[PDB]
Amino acid sequence: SIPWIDNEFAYRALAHLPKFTQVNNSSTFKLRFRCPVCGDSKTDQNKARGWYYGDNNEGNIHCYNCNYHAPIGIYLKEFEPDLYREYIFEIRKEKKKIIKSLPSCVRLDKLAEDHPIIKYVKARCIPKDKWKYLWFTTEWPKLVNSIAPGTYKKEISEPRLVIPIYNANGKAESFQGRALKKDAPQKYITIEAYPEATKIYGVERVKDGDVYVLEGPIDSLFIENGIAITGGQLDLEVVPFKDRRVWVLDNEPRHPDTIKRMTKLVDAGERVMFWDKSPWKSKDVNDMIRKEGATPEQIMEYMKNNIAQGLMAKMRLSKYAK
């Protein structure tokens, strides 16, 4: 199939659909739109559950509301025949911004001990020395609009934990907001300054030895040589230290997405970490420390012993899957 002509043609077809957004990362092409078949959600007028994925072999449209799933060619044949004509004809035709300052953000180590966010991060049991890698704000939409304007229409004051991300050079290129309130648009709001920014927290703090890669930036604070991808593309390539990285995810043996990521990592021949002999039962290392009384150096003891690679990693995954 021809992917780029599908991306070009799909865009115009889905451009007519309302709530049209171009979810284009550095390596994928997706289009978000309201589904034209069902009108998406009747109750929520602002939901766009129709999606187009063009990064595969064939660009396919999938609706998460009415379970419509089709190729772009069938979509064009059924709904846009004038666009469908040229689409099938054209087949024969071819065949950086750096965060220099953080306004209204105060670092946690220079804050007073009676601050309510200090009580929360003490309840999260972060060690004190990591407190100079964390900021706090009350004007998070104002801060984001100071960095990337236009994403927040109204700058209502929201207290959020600032999580600046530095490169190997140590320059801040993105920042993540942890939601202090239980009610929020998102638990982790990642904001980039330029679209090719690194999404791996704390790359500047990597020393010699094995590099442990986790899922949470707060989870990496207990870990020596602990960095954390903030979702995004989850690209192993964009992740450095490929010869010596350690792939640590959250402890969830019955969760299908976690074992899907484990299978993707172990089929790539990577060094994946396994919780199959863990004395603790919590989902993440921070939850293990907070709820099961675990101290960090026991955890530094367990993982190093159970580091796995290749075939003996696969058999472990086989027993950790269920």
Partner: protein, 432 residues
């Protein structure tokens, strides 16, 4: 002009009776018009009458449609209104629109066909026609006019029938007068003709002789051989046409000079056709294979045969049947039906061969109940012949033909005529 077409379908009896039988859902669009026409077609199928606005927007529109489709159909139905237009201009404009849409659909279909065939196998979307049948689709799209041609009326079409009679535009005469006096002018175009001889009795000497006669009569002949190579069949044809014994071409009693001289003497004659011999492995060619061969010959060599001679009907395979059957009755009957369908589709006289039963071996007479492979083959054949040269006719270089089934005439008129075989030259000569 979809709106006008729909409006005058709803609000005009004459226009409806004129244009409805030629209407198809693949002409309007991929939106509201197609859905409205689907509603109208469903109503007409269910009740045999043109729906009204109430039937469209109440009895039919309340169906399984999305919001956008529902809104489009509602707008289109509300927009329908009767307009005074002449019922000669409406029909002509509708015919032009239908022809344009048929051409557009054919162009899109052939584009897809080319795109699919460009892809490598295992993803080639089977049941989709090959690139060879692009022109036939376009030709079909061209002839999409609104003319009533359903069958052959007896009283309304006697002029064309008389033209066919006087022209005799179905007969292909033989070179043998004996085979012309029993067929009343030779074999017909869309027919399946069969020879039954036995084992090493004929059954390919006869087919080669018929091919040679048709070649001398200017016809294009296609010899599809399943049991013999192309070279041996061509050698039999050379023995027939060059008046040289089949052994002489093997031992070496014929020089290259006289061979080339005879070939060039035949070439200079304007009354000589083209004979093309194609071999297939025994049991590995069906009617679809023959159609592919015909298309390849037409495209590459510009060869459209008028005579197709299959060396053996019983060692082919059935295109319709997918799992091989140990029952020879059904398989051979299916093969014969497919071959006759190919013959009537291509308007080519199709000759083939059939094996007789062991009981008929060394039997002075062979009845139709001596057919070996299947009893359905004699039912589908238009003309069968039996070769019964047992022992004495061989000493006299004779072969007796019985005429077991004759659809060109009465088989009881000239049942036996004692053909003059010559096995060295591989030919039939009369006893006039």
């Amino acid at each position: 002009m979809v709106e006008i077409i729909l409006s005058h379908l709803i609000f005009d009896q004459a226009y409806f009776s004129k244009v409805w039988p030629y209407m198809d859902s693949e002409y309007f669009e991929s939106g509201p018009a197609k859905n409205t026409f689907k509603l109208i077609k469903s109503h007409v199928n269910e009740y045999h009458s043109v729906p009204s606005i109430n039937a469209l927007n109440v009895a039919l529109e309340n169906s399984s449609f999305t919001e956008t489709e529902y809104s489009g159909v509602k707008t289109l139905i509300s927009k329908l209104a009767d307009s005074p237009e002449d019922h000669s201009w409406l029909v002509k404009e509708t015919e032009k629109y239908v022809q344009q849409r048929a051409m557009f659909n054919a162009t899109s279909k052939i584009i897809e066909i080319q795109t699919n065939a460009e892809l490598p196998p295992e993803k080639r979307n089977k049941k989709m026609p090959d690139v060879g049948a692009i022109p036939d689709i376009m030709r079909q799209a061209l002839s999409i006019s609104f003319d009533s041609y359903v069958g052959h009326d007896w009283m309304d079409d006697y002029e064309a029938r008389w033209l066919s009679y006087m022209n005799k535009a179905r007969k292909v005469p033989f070179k043998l007068r004996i085979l012309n006096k029993i067929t009343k002018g030779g074999a017909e175009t869309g027919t399946l003709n069969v020879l039954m001889a036995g084992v090493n009795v004929g059954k390919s000497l006869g087919l080669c002789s018929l091919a040679a006669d048709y070649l001398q009569l200017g016809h294009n002949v296609l010899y599809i051989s399943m049991e013999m190579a192309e070279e041996v069949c061509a050698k039999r044809i050379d023995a027939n046409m060059l008046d040289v014994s089949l052994d002489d071409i093997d031992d070496g009693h014929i020089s290259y000079a006289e061979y080339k001289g005879k070939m060039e003497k035949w070439r200079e004659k304007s009354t000589l056709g083209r004979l093309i011999v194609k071999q297939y492995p025994t049991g590995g060619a069906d009617a679809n294979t023959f159609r592919s061969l015909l298309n390849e010959l037409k495209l590459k060599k510009n060869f459209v045969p008028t005579i197709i001679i299959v060396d053996y009907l019983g060692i082919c395979k059935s295109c319709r049947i997918r799992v091989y059957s140990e029952n020879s009755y059904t398989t051979v009957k299916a093969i014969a039906e497919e071959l006759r369908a190919l013959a009537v589709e291509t308007e080519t006289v199709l000759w083939t061969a059939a094996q007789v039963g062991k009981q008929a071996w060394d039997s002075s007479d062979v009845n139709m109940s001596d057919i070996a492979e299947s009893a359905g083959l004699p039912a589908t054949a238009d003309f069968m012949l039996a070769v019964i040269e047992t022992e004495e006719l061989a000493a006299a270089e004779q072969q007796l033909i019985k005429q077991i089934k004759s659809r060109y005439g009465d088989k009881n008129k000239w049942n036996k005529f004692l053909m003059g075989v010559q096995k060295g030259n591989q030919k039939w000569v009369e006893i006039e």
